[PDB]
């Protein structure tokens, strides 16, 4: 099944050193000659997501589904961008934009290299609120928004990544009946955890937990509480505490995203407006 507008010649692709791995594939650095149509002569440094030697049938299928999802999203400043793919005659290669600073979690943990200021943190939250606004506008739910799924480029631009669990949503709620779920519990909304319902407001909840990760410089959500005990505490109204240096205006923002009623939570459009005002006065 070839899509000519995304197919990239294998000869033009030279693989390099590894960049990371999980239990769904691996990512290697690579050189791609003429993949950028704006400069069709220069070789572009890219990242290639591919299967592993111990890959499964679902691993291949998930990588194919993540490829099709990224085709629909399009380019944005705060979203990792699909550049091409190698599907015909050989292993599936998913070629995406390269980010040299890693993922946001290890990025912030390595600044407790550089050093993070209050403006830097607010700048991070603003860009991630803009990437989700365009993502929500494109009729998409990420379902796996976390600090580890955000990439940082050489010029410190936040890139939303990991669309393996992303789905398209229309005007009503997304809903399926599952033998068991696959979303990280500590970032899930109560309706996603209990009712198996996911909307753009469920991504707002994850954004709140994402805010907590950012202002803790890479801490783990609900510190000291196992995944097993989080179930009962969410039903009873437990929320995370305010970080050490985090303005109350930004903690009320987190508590807004963490509202029980999904429709009562802010929209990503409103988060961009509020963060814009907070950022300009710094
Ligand atoms: N464009 C890119 N540039 C540099 N590193 C990248 C990258 N894209 C992904 N990576 C890194 O490759 C590593 C593994 O990739 P990926 O994030 O897709 O696996 P994963 O996180 O879904 C499995 P797990 O969560 O169990 O570790 C990650 O640490 C990620 O930061
Ligand atoms: Mg990840």
Tab-separated table of C-alpha atoms and ligand atoms in Angstrom:
chain	number	residue	atom	x	y	z
A	1	UNK	CA	0.000	0.000	0.000
A	2	UNK	CA	2.054	2.915	-1.341
A	3	UNK	CA	1.232	6.585	-0.805
A	4	UNK	CA	3.374	8.404	-3.406
A	5	UNK	CA	3.272	11.846	-1.770
A	6	UNK	CA	4.933	10.434	1.372
A	7	UNK	CA	7.163	7.704	-0.084
A	8	UNK	CA	10.900	8.334	0.268
A	9	UNK	CA	13.644	6.498	-1.673
A	10	UNK	CA	15.644	4.127	0.517
A	11	UNK	CA	18.881	4.912	-1.341
A	12	UNK	CA	18.544	8.554	-0.244
A	13	UNK	CA	18.401	7.497	3.442
A	14	UNK	CA	21.539	6.802	5.504
A	15	UNK	CA	20.957	5.533	9.041
A	16	UNK	CA	23.150	6.607	11.949
A	17	UNK	CA	23.351	6.210	15.710
A	18	UNK	CA	20.385	5.186	17.887
A	19	UNK	CA	18.338	7.823	19.693
A	20	UNK	CA	16.129	5.710	21.966
A	21	UNK	CA	13.833	2.735	22.240
A	22	UNK	CA	10.787	1.354	24.011
A	23	UNK	CA	8.404	-1.606	23.710
A	24	UNK	CA	6.888	-0.438	20.431
A	25	UNK	CA	9.873	0.332	18.189
A	26	UNK	CA	13.152	2.217	18.076
A	27	UNK	CA	14.382	5.570	16.766
A	28	UNK	CA	17.690	6.101	14.972
A	29	UNK	CA	19.310	9.260	13.680
A	30	UNK	CA	19.609	9.417	9.912
A	31	UNK	CA	20.600	11.522	6.915
A	32	UNK	CA	17.949	12.164	4.248
A	33	UNK	CA	19.099	13.686	0.954
A	34	UNK	CA	16.566	16.058	-0.584
A	35	UNK	CA	13.707	15.210	1.762
A	36	UNK	CA	13.007	18.937	2.241
A	37	UNK	CA	11.390	20.160	-0.970
A	38	UNK	CA	12.242	23.754	-0.006
A	39	UNK	CA	15.956	22.863	-0.340
A	40	UNK	CA	15.926	19.726	-2.512
A	41	UNK	CA	19.736	19.487	-2.781
A	42	UNK	CA	20.834	19.504	0.875
A	43	UNK	CA	20.877	16.472	3.152
A	44	UNK	CA	18.568	16.866	6.159
A	45	UNK	CA	19.234	15.296	9.559
A	46	UNK	CA	16.103	13.326	10.484
A	47	UNK	CA	14.826	10.750	12.957
A	48	UNK	CA	13.576	7.351	11.789
A	49	UNK	CA	11.090	5.299	13.798
A	50	UNK	CA	11.233	1.581	13.009
A	51	UNK	CA	10.449	-1.841	14.435
A	52	UNK	CA	12.797	-3.975	16.532
A	53	UNK	CA	14.092	-7.514	16.143
A	54	UNK	CA	11.622	-8.685	18.818
A	55	UNK	CA	8.703	-6.733	17.344
A	56	UNK	CA	5.213	-8.233	17.331
A	57	UNK	CA	2.207	-8.116	15.017
A	58	UNK	CA	0.698	-5.235	16.993
A	59	UNK	CA	4.024	-3.366	16.954
A	60	UNK	CA	3.945	-3.277	13.152
A	61	UNK	CA	0.249	-2.372	13.110
A	62	UNK	CA	0.649	0.401	15.699
A	63	UNK	CA	3.532	1.936	13.735
A	64	UNK	CA	1.392	1.903	10.585
A	65	UNK	CA	-1.521	3.538	12.424
A	66	UNK	CA	0.766	6.210	13.887
A	67	UNK	CA	2.031	6.947	10.367
A	68	UNK	CA	-1.486	7.473	9.002
A	69	UNK	CA	-2.387	9.701	11.962
A	70	UNK	CA	0.590	12.016	11.390
A	71	UNK	CA	-0.380	12.413	7.722
A	72	UNK	CA	-3.711	13.946	8.776
A	73	UNK	CA	-2.304	16.370	11.367
A	74	UNK	CA	-0.105	18.521	9.139
A	75	UNK	CA	2.708	20.885	10.023
A	76	UNK	CA	2.725	23.138	13.084
A	77	UNK	CA	5.369	24.958	15.086
A	78	UNK	CA	4.848	22.886	18.258
A	79	UNK	CA	4.156	19.454	16.720
A	80	UNK	CA	6.772	16.985	15.521
A	81	UNK	CA	6.415	16.828	11.756
A	82	UNK	CA	6.220	13.814	9.449
A	83	UNK	CA	8.693	14.193	6.577
A	84	UNK	CA	8.264	10.908	4.711
A	85	UNK	CA	8.195	7.148	4.929
A	86	UNK	CA	9.693	3.993	3.421
A	87	UNK	CA	6.946	1.370	3.083
A	88	UNK	CA	7.651	-0.463	-0.189
A	89	UNK	CA	10.137	-3.349	-0.330
A	90	UNK	CA	11.744	-3.452	3.086
A	91	UNK	CA	11.130	-2.480	6.701
A	92	UNK	CA	8.684	0.307	7.463
A	93	UNK	CA	10.608	3.544	8.039
A	94	UNK	CA	8.717	6.510	9.512
A	95	UNK	CA	10.785	9.660	8.938
A	96	UNK	CA	10.006	12.589	11.248
A	97	UNK	CA	11.607	15.877	12.243
A	98	UNK	CA	14.765	15.651	14.352
A	99	UNK	CA	15.017	17.224	17.820
A	100	UNK	CA	18.500	17.364	19.330
A	101	UNK	CA	17.616	18.135	22.973
A	102	UNK	CA	15.662	14.943	23.686
A	103	UNK	CA	12.306	14.698	25.419
A	104	UNK	CA	10.970	17.346	27.787
A	105	UNK	CA	11.329	15.164	30.901
A	106	UNK	CA	15.060	14.502	30.525
A	107	UNK	CA	15.387	18.057	29.182
A	108	UNK	CA	14.051	19.676	32.358
A	109	UNK	CA	15.831	17.123	34.560
A	110	UNK	CA	19.117	18.237	32.960
A	111	UNK	CA	18.560	21.858	34.063
A	112	UNK	CA	17.873	21.507	37.808
A	113	UNK	CA	23.452	21.777	31.266
A	114	UNK	CA	21.551	25.054	30.908
A	115	UNK	CA	19.341	26.633	33.573
A	116	UNK	CA	15.586	27.180	33.555
A	117	UNK	CA	14.027	30.507	34.549
A	118	UNK	CA	10.402	31.336	35.286
A	119	UNK	CA	10.027	32.798	31.790
A	120	UNK	CA	11.419	29.580	30.287
A	121	UNK	CA	8.803	27.463	32.069
A	122	UNK	CA	5.902	29.720	31.054
A	123	UNK	CA	7.278	29.753	27.506
A	124	UNK	CA	7.158	25.943	27.524
A	125	UNK	CA	3.532	25.844	28.673
A	126	UNK	CA	2.499	28.426	26.070
A	127	UNK	CA	3.938	26.488	23.122
A	128	UNK	CA	2.374	23.222	24.289
A	129	UNK	CA	-0.976	24.979	24.673
A	130	UNK	CA	-0.663	26.213	21.077
A	131	UNK	CA	0.224	22.787	19.694
A	132	UNK	CA	-2.823	21.243	21.355
A	133	UNK	CA	-5.079	24.053	20.112
A	134	UNK	CA	-4.128	23.343	16.498
A	135	UNK	CA	-4.301	19.615	17.251
A	136	UNK	CA	-7.800	19.966	18.716
A	137	UNK	CA	-8.804	22.127	15.743
A	138	UNK	CA	-7.650	19.339	13.405
A	139	UNK	CA	-10.168	17.007	15.142
A	140	UNK	CA	-7.598	14.918	17.004
A	141	UNK	CA	-7.231	13.599	20.552
A	142	UNK	CA	-3.710	12.797	21.699
A	143	UNK	CA	-4.625	10.498	24.645
A	144	UNK	CA	-0.963	10.257	25.741
A	145	UNK	CA	0.058	13.828	26.587
A	146	UNK	CA	3.031	13.827	28.969
A	147	UNK	CA	6.453	15.396	29.422
A	148	UNK	CA	8.180	12.323	27.969
A	149	UNK	CA	6.096	12.676	24.772
A	150	UNK	CA	7.285	16.257	24.138
A	151	UNK	CA	10.461	16.859	22.126
A	152	UNK	CA	12.823	19.839	22.328
A	153	UNK	CA	14.759	21.025	19.283
A	154	UNK	CA	18.169	22.685	18.995
A	155	UNK	CA	16.471	26.103	19.248
A	156	UNK	CA	14.371	25.073	22.292
A	157	UNK	CA	11.040	24.648	20.482
A	158	UNK	CA	8.600	22.293	22.194
A	159	UNK	CA	7.400	19.527	19.839
A	160	UNK	CA	4.438	17.293	20.683
A	161	UNK	CA	5.154	13.706	19.629
A	162	UNK	CA	4.028	10.092	20.146
A	163	UNK	CA	0.806	9.764	18.134
A	164	UNK	CA	0.588	5.977	18.491
A	165	UNK	CA	-2.495	6.323	20.705
A	166	UNK	CA	-3.981	9.350	18.929
A	167	UNK	CA	-7.425	9.060	17.351
A	168	UNK	CA	-9.727	11.264	15.298
A	169	UNK	CA	-12.831	12.654	16.991
A	170	UNK	CA	-15.930	14.331	15.556
A	171	UNK	CA	-18.526	16.352	17.555
A	172	UNK	CA	-19.602	13.726	20.127
A	173	UNK	CA	-17.501	11.782	22.626
A	174	UNK	CA	-15.059	9.082	21.577
A	175	UNK	CA	-16.098	5.771	23.105
A	176	UNK	CA	-15.042	2.121	22.872
A	177	UNK	CA	-15.575	-0.966	25.030
A	178	UNK	CA	-12.198	-2.486	25.890
A	179	UNK	CA	-10.967	-5.673	27.526
A	180	UNK	CA	-8.450	-3.314	29.205
A	181	UNK	CA	-7.050	0.145	28.449
A	182	UNK	CA	-3.613	1.292	27.310
A	183	UNK	CA	-3.386	4.872	28.596
A	184	UNK	CA	-1.005	5.891	31.408
A	185	UNK	CA	-3.248	6.138	34.453
A	186	UNK	CA	-1.627	9.120	36.179
A	187	UNK	CA	-2.338	11.360	33.164
A	188	UNK	CA	-5.876	10.135	32.429
A	189	UNK	CA	-9.026	12.105	33.152
A	190	UNK	CA	-11.664	10.601	35.475
A	191	UNK	CA	-14.118	10.137	32.602
A	192	UNK	CA	-11.429	8.363	30.567
A	193	UNK	CA	-10.506	6.142	33.520
A	194	UNK	CA	-14.021	5.266	34.726
A	195	UNK	CA	-16.366	5.909	31.780
A	196	UNK	CA	-13.934	5.130	28.909
A	197	UNK	CA	-14.826	8.516	27.396
A	198	UNK	CA	-12.237	10.804	25.801
A	199	UNK	CA	-12.768	14.313	24.416
A	200	UNK	CA	-10.657	17.422	23.906
A	201	UNK	CA	-11.417	18.209	27.552
A	202	UNK	CA	-9.750	14.927	28.528
A	203	UNK	CA	-6.620	16.239	26.799
A	204	UNK	CA	-6.986	19.389	28.915
A	205	UNK	CA	-6.732	17.226	32.041
A	206	UNK	CA	-3.519	15.670	30.709
A	207	UNK	CA	-2.289	19.193	29.951
A	208	UNK	CA	-2.754	20.048	33.623
A	209	UNK	CA	-0.666	17.063	34.683
A	210	UNK	CA	1.748	18.154	31.954
A	211	UNK	CA	1.891	21.603	33.574
A	212	UNK	CA	2.727	19.943	36.896
A	213	UNK	CA	5.535	17.957	35.257
A	214	UNK	CA	6.982	21.120	33.706
A	215	UNK	CA	7.029	23.231	36.868
A	216	UNK	CA	8.481	20.381	38.939
A	217	UNK	CA	11.366	20.286	36.409
A	218	UNK	CA	10.479	16.702	35.535
A	219	UNK	CA	8.889	15.271	38.674
A	220	UNK	CA	6.536	12.325	38.719
A	221	UNK	CA	2.809	13.063	39.096
A	222	UNK	CA	1.098	12.139	42.378
A	223	UNK	CA	4.424	11.620	44.192
A	224	UNK	CA	4.493	8.652	46.550
A	225	UNK	CA	1.109	7.269	45.435
A	226	UNK	CA	1.031	4.004	43.436
A	227	UNK	CA	-1.060	3.586	40.309
A	228	UNK	CA	-3.205	1.125	42.275
A	229	UNK	CA	-4.281	3.703	44.880
A	230	UNK	CA	-4.927	6.526	42.384
A	231	UNK	CA	-8.292	5.004	41.404
A	232	UNK	CA	-9.958	5.564	44.778
A	233	UNK	CA	-8.361	8.991	45.309
A	234	UNK	CA	-9.675	10.395	42.019
A	235	UNK	CA	-13.225	9.360	42.940
A	236	UNK	CA	-12.849	11.184	46.272
A	237	UNK	CA	-11.555	14.462	44.838
A	238	UNK	CA	-7.811	14.230	45.468
A	239	UNK	CA	-5.600	16.590	43.465
A	240	UNK	CA	-1.868	17.206	43.289
A	241	UNK	CA	-0.247	19.910	45.395
A	242	UNK	CA	1.291	23.120	44.102
A	243	UNK	CA	4.977	22.874	43.051
A	244	UNK	CA	7.732	24.712	44.923
A	245	UNK	CA	8.088	27.793	42.693
A	246	UNK	CA	4.817	28.042	40.762
A	247	UNK	CA	2.566	31.087	40.871
A	248	UNK	CA	-0.906	30.578	42.305
A	249	UNK	CA	-2.296	31.869	39.002
A	250	UNK	CA	-0.663	28.898	37.255
A	251	UNK	CA	-1.737	26.440	39.963
A	252	UNK	CA	-5.337	27.618	39.633
A	253	UNK	CA	-4.808	26.945	35.926
A	254	UNK	CA	-3.805	23.369	36.784
A	255	UNK	CA	-6.794	23.036	39.125
A	256	UNK	CA	-9.022	24.307	36.306
A	257	UNK	CA	-7.821	21.555	33.958
A	258	UNK	CA	-8.307	19.138	36.876
A	259	UNK	CA	-12.008	19.968	37.206
A	260	UNK	CA	-14.275	16.946	37.606
A	261	UNK	CA	-16.863	18.167	35.075
A	262	UNK	CA	-15.139	17.952	31.660
A	263	UNK	CA	-17.232	20.731	30.096
A	264	UNK	CA	-16.296	22.954	33.060
A	265	UNK	CA	-12.577	22.684	32.240
A	266	UNK	CA	-10.942	25.373	30.080
A	267	UNK	CA	-10.455	24.872	26.376
A	268	UNK	CA	-7.033	24.942	24.746
A	269	UNK	CA	-8.082	28.196	23.063
A	270	UNK	CA	-8.590	29.792	26.485
A	271	UNK	CA	-5.301	28.428	27.841
A	272	UNK	CA	-3.413	30.100	24.983
A	273	UNK	CA	-5.062	33.443	25.767
A	274	UNK	CA	-4.290	33.251	29.495
A	275	UNK	CA	-0.691	32.111	28.976
A	276	UNK	CA	-0.146	34.880	26.410
A	277	UNK	CA	-1.017	37.520	29.014
A	278	UNK	CA	1.128	35.861	31.695
A	279	UNK	CA	4.110	35.508	29.342
A	280	UNK	CA	4.206	39.100	28.047
A	281	UNK	CA	4.456	40.466	31.620
A	282	UNK	CA	7.749	38.718	32.423
B	1	LIG	N1	12.749	13.179	16.615
B	1	LIG	C1	13.493	12.667	17.753
B	1	LIG	N2	14.709	13.160	18.034
B	1	LIG	C2	15.432	12.706	19.087
B	1	LIG	N3	14.928	11.729	19.890
B	1	LIG	C3	13.701	11.193	19.651
B	1	LIG	C4	12.945	11.658	18.557
B	1	LIG	N4	11.802	10.976	18.553
B	1	LIG	C5	11.794	10.116	19.570
B	1	LIG	N5	12.936	10.219	20.259
B	1	LIG	C6	13.308	9.495	21.393
B	1	LIG	O1	13.398	8.042	21.104
B	1	LIG	C7	12.969	7.420	22.371
B	1	LIG	C8	11.993	6.350	22.097
B	1	LIG	O2	11.020	6.807	21.190
B	1	LIG	P1	9.470	6.805	21.629
B	1	LIG	O3	9.176	8.043	22.437
B	1	LIG	O4	8.599	6.802	20.387
B	1	LIG	O5	9.177	5.490	22.473
B	1	LIG	P2	8.070	5.445	23.614
B	1	LIG	O6	8.304	6.564	24.588
B	1	LIG	O7	6.649	5.592	22.974
B	1	LIG	C9	8.182	3.825	24.492
B	1	LIG	P3	8.306	4.034	26.323
B	1	LIG	O8	7.415	5.150	26.786
B	1	LIG	O9	7.871	2.697	27.022
B	1	LIG	O10	9.788	4.349	26.716
B	1	LIG	C10	12.390	8.455	23.217
B	1	LIG	O11	13.202	8.691	24.366
B	1	LIG	C11	12.324	9.646	22.442
B	1	LIG	O12	12.642	10.774	23.276
B	2	LIG	MG1	7.498	8.825	24.442
